[PDB]
Design an enzyme around this catalytic site. Structure first.
Site, mmCIF file in Angstrom:
data_model
loop_
_atom_site.group_PDB
_atom_site.id
_atom_site.type_symbol
_atom_site.label_atom_id
_atom_site.label_comp_id
_atom_site.label_asym_id
_atom_site.label_seq_id
_atom_site.Cartn_x
_atom_site.Cartn_y
_atom_site.Cartn_z
ATOM 1 N N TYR A 38 7.241 -2.047 2.381
ATOM 2 C CA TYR A 38 7.043 -2.865 1.178
ATOM 3 C C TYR A 38 7.954 -2.315 0.083
ATOM 4 O O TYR A 38 8.186 -1.122 0.053
ATOM 5 C CB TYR A 38 5.589 -2.825 0.667
ATOM 6 N N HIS A 40 8.564 -6.467 0.641
ATOM 7 C CA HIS A 40 9.257 -7.273 1.615
ATOM 8 C C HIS A 40 9.218 -8.731 1.274
ATOM 9 O O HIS A 40 8.414 -9.178 0.475
ATOM 10 C CB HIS A 40 8.899 -7.008 3.083
ATOM 11 N N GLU A 58 6.617 -9.480 -1.692
ATOM 12 C CA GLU A 58 5.225 -9.067 -1.777
ATOM 13 C C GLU A 58 5.097 -7.562 -1.808
ATOM 14 O O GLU A 58 5.848 -6.844 -1.148
ATOM 15 C CB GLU A 58 4.363 -9.692 -0.675
ATOM 16 N N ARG A 77 -2.049 -8.453 -2.296
ATOM 17 C CA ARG A 77 -0.637 -8.399 -2.656
ATOM 18 C C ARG A 77 -0.332 -9.136 -3.912
ATOM 19 O O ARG A 77 -0.929 -10.181 -4.208
ATOM 20 C CB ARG A 77 0.256 -9.107 -1.632
ATOM 21 N N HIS A 92 -5.168 -11.486 2.180
ATOM 22 C CA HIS A 92 -5.413 -11.716 3.585
ATOM 23 C C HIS A 92 -6.919 -11.909 3.745
ATOM 24 O O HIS A 92 -7.411 -12.440 4.734
ATOM 25 C CB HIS A 92 -5.008 -10.490 4.421
ATOM 26 N N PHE A 100 -2.691 -15.977 4.384
ATOM 27 C CA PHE A 100 -3.072 -15.652 3.043
ATOM 28 C C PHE A 100 -3.805 -16.768 2.355
ATOM 29 O O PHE A 100 -3.704 -17.936 2.691
ATOM 30 C CB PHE A 100 -1.769 -15.481 2.190
#
Ligand SMILES: Nc1ncnc2c1ncn2[C@@H]1O[C@H](CO)[C@@H](O)[C@H]1OP(=O)(O)O
Ligand SMILES: [Ca+2]
Length: 104
Positions: A38, A40, A58, A77, A92, A100
């Site tokens: 991350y 990404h 994110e 995120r 998530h 998501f």
């Protein structure tokens, strides 16, 4: 009161701002952290109503208030664009698999 609620996670604007800033810095530096690397790229195939343009990236936002430094990223995120504009907060949690849903 929460500015953003991700499942049962509660976030204030300040929390979002801090996470965003860390993620954006790494982005600028062409750097990543964590096994999933991350920050990404984030693809908006679900069509969330982000009022800011892509590309989007994110970065994990931790329930604890700490800035993500590797380790488990949890389910939440923050999504920011190329211009360091906040796109939104997603999770998530409550979504199948690796999909998501938006934080409310
Ligand atoms: N806590 C979590 N719940 C669900 N999917 C997760 C997760 N942590 C990482 N992932 C996903 O695991 C896969 C590897 C990626 O698609 C990654 O999605 P993400 O990086 O967009 O969160
Ligand atoms: Ca907090």
């Amino acid at each position: 009161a929460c500015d953003y609620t991700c499942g049962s996670n509660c976030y204030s604007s300040s929390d979002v701002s801090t996470a965003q800033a860390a993620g954006y810095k790494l982005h600028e530096d062409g750097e990543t952290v964590g096994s999933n690397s991350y920050p990404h790229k984030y693809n908006n195939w679900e069509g969330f109503d982000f009022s800011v343009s892509s590309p989007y990236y994110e970065w994990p936002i931790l329930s604890s208030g700490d800035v993500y430094s590797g380790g488990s990223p949890g389910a939440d995120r923050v999504v920011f664009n190329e211009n360091n504009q906040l796109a939104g907060v997603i999770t998530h949690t409550g979504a199948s698999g690796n999909n998501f849903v938006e934080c409310t």
